[PDB]
Amino acid sequence: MENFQKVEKIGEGTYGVVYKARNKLTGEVVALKKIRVPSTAIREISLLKELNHPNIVKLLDVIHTENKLYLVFEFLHQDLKKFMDASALTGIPLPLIKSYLFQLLQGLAFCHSHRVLHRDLKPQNLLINTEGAIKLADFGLARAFGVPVRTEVVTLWYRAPEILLGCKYYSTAVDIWSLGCIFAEMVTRRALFPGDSEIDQLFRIFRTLGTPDEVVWPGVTSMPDYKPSFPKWARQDFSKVVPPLDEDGRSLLSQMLHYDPNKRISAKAALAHPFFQDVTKPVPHLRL
Ligand SMILES: Nc1nc(OC[C@H]2CCC(=O)N2)c2nc[nH]c2n1
């Protein structure tokens, strides 16, 4: 760490305080994340150093000294939550929503092809630049360090239903669910399922997509946290959930929101959906 000068505190992340810093020898500007150390974790992280893709924030190095751990990442100038908030009066234009989704799907397809999951996608770990790129931050850190209840409260808004129902061996499909919620959020300017507890989260899902049963999700009634006493709500039309969105968009979103994780659309198949027939790469208006 003597090799870096901290420029400012960017914020609080899932695992610790995140700083903007400058490397004293190379001059590189980076994001430095303090992790608040078991062998297993160091090995896992170490493997993420080779999982390189243009839509994945680059892990530059891992620093482990005096039993403290710092991850050095590529620095981008803003996250999607701040971009959304700044764009609130008028919304992010559809072609840019579309471009970001496509690129995020490319990111996911890459990691998922190597069996690595994110597990904790949320606007705050989606980072953008001035060229129109968007990239996924903290990929793989969940399985390396776990996902805690508090850091700040950890948000449940983007969590897939299988996780909430206590499935122990969930799959890459959880990341597709998350991205779908984020897609809907971009389009409506409002979080799709803003739960404030685990049951509140589930019931928000059920209130919009219908309470899941054996017809839509074989095996669901056997999941560890499923209760027969869950209220049974009817599903709503996607026309009411994300109105602005045209039918291609609504079709894709519904496939990314399938209850059954084995039928939920994959990132690779999502990339082939007709929604992306006319995709382009616009540049955002960013005030840095
Ligand atoms: N600019 C920036 N910011 C980061 O974290 C931003 C998230 C953390 C908590 C928050 O509020 N936003 C990064 N992570 C890797 N590279 C980064 N570059």
Q: How is 160-194 classified by DSSP, letter by letter?
A: -HHHHTT-SS--THHHHHHHHHHHHHHHHSS-S--
In contact, 179 and 112? CB cutoff 8 Å: no
Question: Closest ligand 1 atom, CA of 74?
Answer: 16
What's the one-letter identity of residue 167?
C
For 78, phi then psi, to 5°, come to -160, 155
Q: Where in the chain is the domain with CATH 1.10.510.10?
A: 78-286
Technique of determination:
X-ray
Residue 61 parent element (H or E): strand 59-65
Tell me the torsion sign for CA atoms 203, 205, 208, 213.
Answer: negative
Residue 6 parent element (H or E): strand 4-12
* Superfamily name and number for 78-286: Transferase(Phosphotransferase) domain 1 (1.10.510.10)
Does ligand 1 lie within 6 Å of residue 57's CB atom? yes
The DSSP symbol for 233 reads P
C-alpha distances in Å from residue 244, one per residue of 50, 231, 247, 250, 253? 40, 29, 10, 10, 13
Q: Is 120 a catalytic residue?
A: yes
- Cβ atoms within 10 Å of 37's Cβ, excluding its own: 12
In contact, 162 and 174? CB cutoff 8 Å: yes
For 211, phi then psi, to 5°, come to -65, 125
Choose the catalytic residue: 120, 213, 225, 248. 120
Does ligand 1 lie within 6 Å of residue 75's CB atom? yes
Cα-Cα-Cα-Cα dihedral of 202, 206, 211, 212, to 10°?
A: -70
Provide the 3-class DSSP secondary structure of residue 109.
Answer: helix
Q: Where in the chain is the domain with CATH 3.30.200.20?
A: 1-77
**164 half-sphere exposure, CB direction, 13 A CA radius:** 25
Does ligand 1 lie within 6 Å of residue 14's CB atom? no
Annotated binding-site residues read 10-18, 33, 74-76, 79, 122-125, 138
Q: Which residue has the tokens 């992790």?
A: 35
What's the one-letter identity of residue 266?
S
Rounded to whole angstroms, how far apart are CA atoms 254 and 275?
A: 12
Rounded to whole angstroms, how far apart are CA atoms 178 and 160?
A: 7
In contact, 212 and 220? CB cutoff 8 Å: yes
Residue 79 parent element (H or E): strand 78-79
* Superfamily name and number for 1-77: Phosphorylase Kinase; domain 1 (3.30.200.20)
Rounded to whole angstroms, how far apart are CA atoms 203 and 14?
A: 25
CA of 148 to the centre of ligand 1 (A): 18
Give how far the C-alpha of residue 146 lies from the chain's centroid of Cα atoms, to the nearest Å: 15
- For residue 185, give both structure tokens: 């959020």
Longest dimension (CA), the chain: 62
Annotated binding-site residues for Mg(2+) read 125, 138
Rounded to whole angstroms, how far apart are CA atoms 223 and 234?
A: 21
**150 half-sphere exposure, CB direction, 13 A CA radius:** 1
Does ligand 1 lie within 6 Å of residue 124's CB atom? yes
Strand duo 4-12 + 29-35: pairing: unpaired
In contact, 173 and 261? CB cutoff 8 Å: yes
Q: Which residue has the tokens 């291609």?
A: 248
Does ligand 1 lie within 6 Å of residue 123's CB atom? no
From the CA atom positions of the chain, what is the Rg in Å?
19
Does ligand 1 lie within 6 Å of residue 152's CB atom? no
Q: Name the residue of 71, 127, 139 whose CB sits within 8 Å of the most ligand 1 atoms, as the mutation to test its pocket.
A: 127
Q: Name the residue of 8, 9, 10 whose CB sits within 8 Å of the most ligand 1 atoms, as the mutation to test its pocket.
A: 10
